[PDB]
Amino acid sequence: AEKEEGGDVKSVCLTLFLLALRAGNEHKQADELEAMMQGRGFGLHPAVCLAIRVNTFLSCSQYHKMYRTVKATSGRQIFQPLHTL
DNA sequence: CTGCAGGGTTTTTGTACAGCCAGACAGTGGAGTACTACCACTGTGTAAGACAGGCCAGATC
């Protein structure tokens, strides 16, 4: 890190790994991994969450209720928590 | 100091071999899928005032 960046932790791990996987490759993973960080969501971008709360009329406590449920059962939580909304 | 010009630097950007796995293509017969209109039918507009005519009460003469 010192010679080529100086404190850039994320990328060194990311570029070796995605491509290392697609080395002995079935592709399946490349979709999930190429989506994984910057575009988009992964889970769902907090703006899409916010809209899907505000615009379907979910009570805050109701929303969180759902969030807990989807998180605990088979999760891999999707929805973003309240304080990040 | 500016201007451009040989080449330096490191690094891009791709082509070069050759083998190989993945998943798309195409079939099927239809499955049961997913998304579609369509059907009546709804919810939110929410309280005062002005104006005419009566006529009785009661003051004023």
Notes on the protein architecture:
With 85 residues, the chain is an all-alpha fold. It is built from 4 helices and no strands. The longest helix is centred in the first third of the chain and has 13 residues, at 9-21. The protein starts with 8 loop residues before the first helix and ends in a 13-residue tail after the last helix. The relative contact order is 0.10. The chain binds one DNA strand of 61 nucleotides through residues 24-28. It is classed as recombination/dna. Keywords: RAG1, RAG2, V(D)J recombination, Paired complex, Antigen receptor gene recombination, T and B cell development, RECOMBINATION-DNA complex. Cryo-electron microscopy structure of RAG Paired Complex (with NBD, no symmetry).
Helical residue percent? 40-55%
Largest sheet: none
Order of helices and strands: HHHH
Percent strand equals under 5%
Helices and strands: which structural class? mainly alpha
Q: Which value, in Å, is the CA radius of gyration?
A: 17 Å
Overall body shape: elongated
Q: Termini, distance in Å? A: 34 Å
Number of strands: 0
Number of helices: 4
